[PDB]
Design a protein around this nucleic acid. Structure first.
Lengths: 169, 96
RNA sequence: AUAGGAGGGUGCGGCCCGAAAGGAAUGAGCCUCCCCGAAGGAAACCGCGGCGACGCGGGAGUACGAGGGGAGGGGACCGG
RNA sequence: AGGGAAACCGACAUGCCCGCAGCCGGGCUUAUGCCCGGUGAGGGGCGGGGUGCGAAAGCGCCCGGAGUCACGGCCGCGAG
RNA sequence: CAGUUCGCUCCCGUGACCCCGGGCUAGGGGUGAAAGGCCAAUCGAGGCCGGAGAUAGCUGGUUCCCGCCGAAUCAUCCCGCAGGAUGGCCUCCCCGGAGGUAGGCGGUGGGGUAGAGCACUGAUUGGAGGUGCAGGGGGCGAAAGCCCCCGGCCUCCUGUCAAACUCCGAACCCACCGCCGCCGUAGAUGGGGGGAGUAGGGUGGCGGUGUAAGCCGUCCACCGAGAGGGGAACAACCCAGACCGGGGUUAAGGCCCCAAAGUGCCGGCUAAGUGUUACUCCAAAGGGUGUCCCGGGCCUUAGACAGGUCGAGGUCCGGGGCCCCGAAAAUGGACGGGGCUCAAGC
RNA sequence: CCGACACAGGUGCCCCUGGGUGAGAAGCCUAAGGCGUGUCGGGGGAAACCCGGCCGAGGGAACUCGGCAAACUGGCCCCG
RNA sequence: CACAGGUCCCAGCUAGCCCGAAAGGGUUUGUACUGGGGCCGACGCCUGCCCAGUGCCGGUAUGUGAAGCCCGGGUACAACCGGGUGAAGCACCGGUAAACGGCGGGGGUAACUAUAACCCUCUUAAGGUAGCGAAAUUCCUUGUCGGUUAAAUGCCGACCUGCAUGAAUGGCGUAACGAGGUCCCCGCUGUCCCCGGCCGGGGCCCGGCGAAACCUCUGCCUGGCGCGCAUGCCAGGGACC
RNA sequence: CUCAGGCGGGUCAGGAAUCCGCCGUAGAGUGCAAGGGCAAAAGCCGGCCUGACUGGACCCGUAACAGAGGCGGGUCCAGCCCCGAAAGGGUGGCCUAGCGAACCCCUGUGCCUCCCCGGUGGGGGCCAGGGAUGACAGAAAAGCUACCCUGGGGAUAACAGAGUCGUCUCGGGCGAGAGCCCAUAUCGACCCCGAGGCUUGCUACCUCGCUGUCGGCUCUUCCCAUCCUGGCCCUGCAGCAGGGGCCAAGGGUGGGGGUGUUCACCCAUUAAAGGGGAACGUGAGCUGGGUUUAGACCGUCGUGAGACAGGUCGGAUGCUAUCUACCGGGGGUGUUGGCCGCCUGAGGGGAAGGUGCCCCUAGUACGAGAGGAACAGGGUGCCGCGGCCUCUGGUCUACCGG
RNA sequence: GGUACGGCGGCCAUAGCGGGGGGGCCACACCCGGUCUCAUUUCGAACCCGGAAGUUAAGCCCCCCAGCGAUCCCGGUUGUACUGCCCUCCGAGAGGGGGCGGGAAGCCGGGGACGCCGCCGGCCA
């Protein structure tokens, strides 16, 4: 597996038309909703990206697995809702290189990634007051697996930012 | 790979029509008249396939300098060359 | 014989040459004085503003200014 | 005197319109000069004409006289 | 010593042996126990002279001065790709006579890019409702059938997309008309003729491609084909476009010394020689009661914390500036150098 | 004589060789014959280093691609 | 490379093979125990299958097959068109492998587990026999086992899984021979541990004769810029001739 | 006249035979790819017909601006016609692909013409259609070169240099999990951020009027990401030893077997037997074993000449130092007159030293036991360096003897 | 001049889809019957020929709505997203920023919108 810095940046154009892309791989991440989606939770911790970034499906799956394990261990399946709000659409290609070099260098698909915009939410963990610390820790652990700087905010049901208010008292 | 220019080369959107404008256009544009020296814009009607100028000259403004049959003779200046075209009135619009 | 750059360019200073063809005793370098001067352009001092570096008005568009002219002294160099 | 593969046929010495320079007349302008109205060589455009294709229309080329010789120069082709 | 030699060592030395004189085989030919070997220091076709000054798109060279204007390496075609022709861009001469449009304002038309969005086409997490739907599998029943789920297909909610999607849609670009501006009767726009050179471009911004360097186009700004003043030197970066002799003021930028100009002024920050870098060169994720600040909070001046007693402010959170760790290379040494700490850094 | 030469090559080793040792026209010494012209001389603990030659304690191929080079044996008689 | 030996092919003479423009000629003052043309290469034991492919040889009934000749048309004569005859050569048939060259694959295989060995059948002519094998041939490879050494990408013997051995482009073996390549043992030694002395000739100085290769000008460094590795440029360091 | 699909209802008949009603902007269809256009149609079903024609103009595109043989398309005039009541439409396919110079030849159709005239056979010419060049703006066309030759190219490869670091080597963030519990004694998944230019690759920027390759020997020097030697921290550190980490580059890091080998493997010692840079340091220093000419053999491929980043045997290494560089040896000038002698020490160089073992401490501390230290104190070896010839050995072309 | 009358058109959804109430002087229709004109790939269903017994049930005409669709104005998101020219402005990079000039899309809230308009004629006056 090549370094993620090769695909971290969004200079290249969007490459997501499976009708014309030949051999595009299938997704490696298949679960995006976990916990109790229909539960009534007071607070929502959302993780935002600081820069326009491409997050590989491998990183998304790793963050999903670790955060879900931590939440199951420390919260309870019926006390949280962990959701990943972005699906990988961009197709990551690579130069398929006795042995020519840079001749016909158009790349073949090798993976998938999700492209995001500045200050865009990546994932959201809905929890009650008690489990806010665990939600924050899970968000931090997820952020530690991404190729860019990320921050987290706490919103109430309406959508007002109350992160400082809550974390202070 | 180099591609030569043809009549419909790269005209997916230029020669397309608004979805609500599908069908025959009103007959005023078809039956309009012009006078020598009048200046007219070249706006192609994709539905009518007769008397259509090359799409490369779509959107320009030319000078009427005569008439042949039901087509108007329109002169344009491409760079420094004078080009004469025979355009059906349905593909024309008066200036102002 | 304590000094660094393709061996030259700009400016001048030592040492040396300097009859002719270049100026010059019908005056050379040089010393003094007087007049007009384009663009530009101070300060002493007086009053005021600013926390301060400093600035504003007068002095003043004055002294000076590339160059263009004139007079006086000396008597052999200047250019090269 | 051109048109045509060939047989072969075979044309404006100005019918008309715009119009620069020049010329004429008028106004302003010290003058230069500018403006206006006519005539306008050369110039442009119509009209008409010869021939080739055609049943004809219509088109191509051409038609209201400038060429020729010489000295020198640039260039293209072939010869080293 | 020698355009093949000398020394030691080594092999044959009555045989297919070594040597001499007279003869024959001559160049696509001779001779060859076959190595393309030898044929007068020449052999995958000898030498001499003639064709012959052969030809080449390939390499090199092309001789006096000043004056005026001044390019190009991009489109089509070639057994074309180190070469040519037709165009484009340069220059010189002449005809024509009243206009022209690089810039701008307003108007009449064209557009589908950036952005955005799901109204089409194709993708996309979960939930709710509706449909027996060739789904399919089970309970149920000799059998025909029902009852369960799961799946398929529609509507809605929820969470996301598109270079080969668009219900929308700029900046902006182009054509034409009126005008301002500029050029033009000291003759433009335009037309005819003569002579070219140019068919490897580079840097820089943008677009496609690539791990990146790079490759391929586009923009015409700079070098090519460009002096002078600076960035330490530097093609391309900044000022600037230059006839000759003088005077002055400014531009880029600079003022502690090298080095002309301040150890200049006020407020704040840095303790790391961090820095002393406009760009050509410049290290990150992650962390820091290191400091200087801003904004929100909860307790809150004999009451808050540190250890029911003292008795002045505490305890968090999200941020901003500078700095710190993360940070290992080969000749001795690089902020240009010296050096610089209320600065000569920011 | 040929090779550009007063060339260590080739042509001509083409014809011949006293005494001793010895199988020998071998090696060494020597008589006759020839020469000091295989042509620049002189100096010197006057070095390092290079080329030719001799020896070298203990070990004996540990060197090296490889015992390259050198060393060991060496003639004659008898046995085997 | 040659060689003696083996074997194959053409030729009864005005032949076979060959030089040449021709005339004439070489083999030839020759005559099958001969002349000419290939391949292997003393000697010992042997040399298996295949004639579909290419080549060579013989036949060629039959098809095609040039000119010439004949017939009809055409031309006042020809040019021209159609048909008949039709050699060689090809098509066609057969021989020929010490001619060029080839000698696989599956269906399978069972009985003991592998093994599969005998063994039967089809694609096209046949499916590699005797021998030899990790080889001057073996990719994996420094194959595996044994010997040689303390230690073995070496050498020798064996195994067979022969990428890609093999019978006259010969297979296998072989005494004697070799300035051929290759491994080991005794002995020897300055090859080496580890180099040290000595001899003669140069080197060095002095007296003479006396050149050439080469040469943009010049000529100190560290870190940089640059066509990317500078004595000459930039900032520094050092340096008497 | 109106499609695809869907809904409700119908004998065989069900998912799908053939029907009936409703919804249905095209979700159908077009001769064919895609794009666009087409719903009282350009689609579906029917009637008639051949304009898929003849003689000609002007214009757009291929080929913007900006030149073009050939080709395609558009707007028209005339002729003779098709459909329709008429308007109106028809010069092929709804628009964009389905194709091609010169010369020569075949065909149609009318005319001109063939050397003094005329006739006949035959020939030539003008116009239209056709036979093809796919390398498609149009030569008719198989290979080896290692015996090669020539002219050039750093416009263009192999080694090296330069840029980059995908790969390579080496670090860091988080912490699921393994560790009796315990994430961090030790290992650390899935993910993410970096350093070096020590492997390989990519690019083609310098070098093809010449910069000699791998390996070994000789010799010099440098980096730390340290193998040992010096000093420390954590430990799942009792001692003896281990695992992880920090400071530290003064010194050492050796000898052998096969192989051309670097490397890797193996043997006996050792404290250790570290990885790298210097034009993959070092051929005007050496050697020439591997690699890469010319000779030859084997296997495989090719009809063949031949080829093989497949083996195998053989196969040349030029130098009189011009400048600078370093090693030592000399002659001058200057240092305010000259000369002899003795000193000072600014500076530069050094490793002048490095490292084992043995005896005691001690069979002690520690430990159930086995096993087993350290401080201090003594001895000595090896490597390196600088000197000497009394002793021992070599030589001793002085010398003596056989 | 009137008319809850018709024919031929213009812009071609702000005009459409879906709903509610009202009308029959003339006029427009539904509708009665198929000999003649015309037709069914059967059907007088359509098309066509001949008329008025009935009806305004609905096409048509007059008025009304805001459920869907469309679209105009205003306010908020917002001078946000994005962008032309210059830059010795910042950022390790990605990229951003300053000056002058342009400026959305979508969403939310309040209004608009159930079409305007032209020529002629019929009937009445």
């Amino acid at each position: 597996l090549r370094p993620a810095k090769i695909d971290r940046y969004v200079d290249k154009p969007a490459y997501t038309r499976r009708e014309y892309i030949r051999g595009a791989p299938g997704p490696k991440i298949t679960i995006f909703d976990m916990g109790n989606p229909a539960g009534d939770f007071e607070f929502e911790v959302s993780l935002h990206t600081a820069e326009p970034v491409q997050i590989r499906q491998n990183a998304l799956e790793a963050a999903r697995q670790q955060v879900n394990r931590y939440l199951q261990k420390n919260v309870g399946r019926s006390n949280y809702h962990f959701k990943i709000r972005v699906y990988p659409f961009q197709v990551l290609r690579e130069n398929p290189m006795y042995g020519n070099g840079m001749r016909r260098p158009f790349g073949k698909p090798i993976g998938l990634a999700a492209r995001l915009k500045k200050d865009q939410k990546i994932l959201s963990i809905r929890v009650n007051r008690q489990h806010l610390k665990f939600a924050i820790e899970g968000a931090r652990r997820a952020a530690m697996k991404f190729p860019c700087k990320c921050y987290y905010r706490i919103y109430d049901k309406e959508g007002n930012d109350v992160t400082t208010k809550i974390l202070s008292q | 790979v180099q591609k030569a220019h043809s009549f419909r080369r790269k005209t997916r959107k230029k020669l397309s029509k608004h979805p609500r404008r599908r069908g025959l256009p009103p007959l005023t544009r078809f039956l309009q008249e012009f006078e020598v020296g009048q200046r007219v814009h070249i706006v192609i009607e994709p539905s009518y396939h007769k008397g259509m100028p090359d799409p490369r000259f779509h959107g320009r403004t030319g000078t009427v300098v005569g008439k042949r049959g039901e087509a108007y003779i329109v002169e344009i200046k491409d760079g420094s060359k004078v080009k004469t075209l025979f355009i059906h009135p349905v593909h024309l619009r008066p200036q102002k």
